[PDB]
């Protein structure tokens, strides 16, 4: 089967691309000696949501380590988590909050703004000299036109408007926005906490720790390897038959 050989070649090319990407990456920490007790930088000092979902412009100053929002259910209780996930950058399907990004905008208003203030004053900052003590992430969602982004600093100078910079900053700050477990919605929390079967607990643990995807990739690669080995044995038999035919031709 030539399709098995094509799959093996494609997998080899993908592995070569992945190893080239691994070689490209470099260390991003300079190990400034400094002095532990103090929290590292990158936490969200404040969030402001203007014309977002039900509530109007609201200011919330989040704590450095632990936060307890006492917003009652039915008063845009899940709006803060959804806004944080959208601002930090997450797939719309992963969030499962709202039918579409257009619905997230307040009714009667064409545009919604989500602004997050990440802290850079403390150690572990990303480009503290260029971004200063704080990094402001602003997302604009409009019914008409694509959503806009601004990585503005404290003075309001927009450092960048692209999506790659936000992903790079989030990766440096080690925020698993792609992982749904780090930001648990009501449905995800209900599914995880109510698990009774040991298999369900194992599946939830593996999915949350991002080990299930590695196992699936390894199993797919192992199946491709087994199919490629069987096709390689068939090709060796065919090559030996062709070699015998060519020896007869010789």
């Amino acid at each position: 089967i030539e399709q098995v050989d094509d799959e093996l070649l494609s997998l080899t090319a993908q592995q070569e691309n992945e190893e080239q990407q691994q070689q490209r990456k470099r260390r991003r920490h300079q190990f400034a000696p400094m002095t532990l007790e103090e929290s590292p930088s990158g936490y969200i000092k404040k969030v402001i949501l203007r014309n977002f979902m039900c509530h109007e412009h609201f200011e919330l100053e989040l704590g450095s380590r632990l936060n307890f929002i006492v917003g009652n259910n039915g008063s845009g209780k899940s709006a803060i988590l959804t806004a944080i996930t959208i601002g930090l950058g997450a797939k719309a399907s992963e969030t499962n909050r709202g039918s579409s990004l257009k619905d997230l905008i307040r009714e009667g208003c064409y545009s919604a703004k989500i602004i997050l203030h990440l802290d850079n004053s403390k150690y572990g900052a990303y480009q503290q000299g260029i971004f200063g003590n704080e990094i402001i992430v602003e997302r604009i969602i409009k019914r008409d036109g694509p959503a806009s982004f601004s990585l503005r600093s404290e003075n309001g100078k927009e450092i960048s408007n692209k999506k790659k910079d936000i992903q790079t900053v989030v990766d440096y700050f080690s925020v698993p926005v792609s992982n749904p477990m780090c930001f648990l919605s009501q449905d995800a929390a209900r599914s995880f906490l109510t698990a009774s079967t040991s298999q369900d607990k194992y599946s939830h643990f593996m999915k949350g720790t991002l080990l299930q995807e590695i196992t699936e990739n390894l199993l797919y690669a192992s199946a491709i390897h087994d199919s490629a080995q069987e096709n390689m044995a068939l090709h060796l038999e065919n090559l030996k038959s062709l070699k015998a035919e060519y020896e007869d031709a010789k």
Partner: peptide, 13 residues
Amino acid sequence: TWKPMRSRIIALD
């Protein structure tokens, strides 16, 4: 399960 993955920000409902 939250502990092994070092996450700067964790949100729960």
